[PDB]
């Protein structure tokens, strides 16, 4: 019947309005901090809002974008590291080694999972993942050749890159 159907639908309207308005307002507070660029205080403001539904919305965005962020960073930074590893200045090589270690520790697990999986966003990740793996394989040969020096940092890097030979 109409009376029961409409009464049931309108029953929940006011609550939906309040929840969605308040959630929208809270997300806008976080978005404003985000556009300024401060990752720290934008996470802090989401926590400070003390609304679990806002945290869920933001972590859902992070979860879908984090691997693409890491891949984009890697594909820009790896050519610079390769230059540093080829430098005649010891400290440049050391800087490149430290940055490479951090990339391997933090991002190589994500790269492995992407290449080991069954729309446009997945295709974009897989495309950048393949380039990133190409860059690492190139750097891998450089690392293995310089692990013969004695020189120890390249042996640790060789160990972190074992899954590429």
């Amino acid at each position: 019947v109409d009376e029961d159907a409409m009464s049931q639908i309108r029953k929940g309207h006011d609550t939906m309005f309040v929840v969605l308005t308040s959630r929208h307002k809270n997300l806008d507070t976080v978005r404003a901090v985000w556009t300024t660029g401060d990752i720290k205080t934008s996470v802090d403001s989401a926590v400070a809002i003390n609304d679990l539904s806002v945290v869920v919305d933001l972590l859902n965005i992070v979860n879908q974008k984090a691997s693409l962020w890491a891949l984009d960073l890697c594909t820009t930074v790896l050519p610079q590291i390769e230059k540093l590893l080829q430098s005649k200045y010891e400290s440049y090589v050391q800087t490149g080694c430290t940055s490479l270690k951090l990339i391997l520790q933090a991002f190589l697990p994500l790269i492995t999972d992407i290449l080991a999986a069954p729309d446009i966003s997945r295709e974009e990740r897989l495309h950048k993942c393949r380039l990133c793996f190409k860059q690492l394989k190139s750097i891998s040969g450089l690392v293995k050749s310089k692990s013969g020096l004695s020189g120890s940092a390249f042996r640790e890097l060789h160990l972190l890159m074992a899954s590429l030979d």
């Binding site: 109409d2 159907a5 409409m6 049931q8 639908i9 939906m16 978005r31």
Partner: protein, 76 residues
């Protein structure tokens, strides 16, 4: 079916409450169309008027979800 309009309203709201805005928008657009086809199926003019404000209230909820989605798209 009236039971389908009530049910699909319930689903859209549940998806929206849970932050599944893509699925919420499919059902909100579903109910808004389904409610409009039943709206003009109503022979009573007064009953038609009362359904129109239900459509309007549901339409308001759908616009807020879009606004939330638009805000979220800024983080990209």
């Amino acid at each position: 079916s009236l039971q389908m309009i009530v049910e699909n309203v319930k689903l859209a709201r549940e998806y929206a409450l849970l932050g599944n805005y893509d699925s919420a928008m499919v059902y909100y657009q579903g109910v808004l169309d389904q409610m409009n086809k039943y709206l003009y199926s109503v022979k009573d003019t007064h009953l038609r008027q009362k359904w129109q404000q239900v459509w309007q209230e549901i339409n308001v909820e759908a616009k807020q979800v879009k606004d939330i989605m638009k805000t979220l798209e800024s983080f990209k």
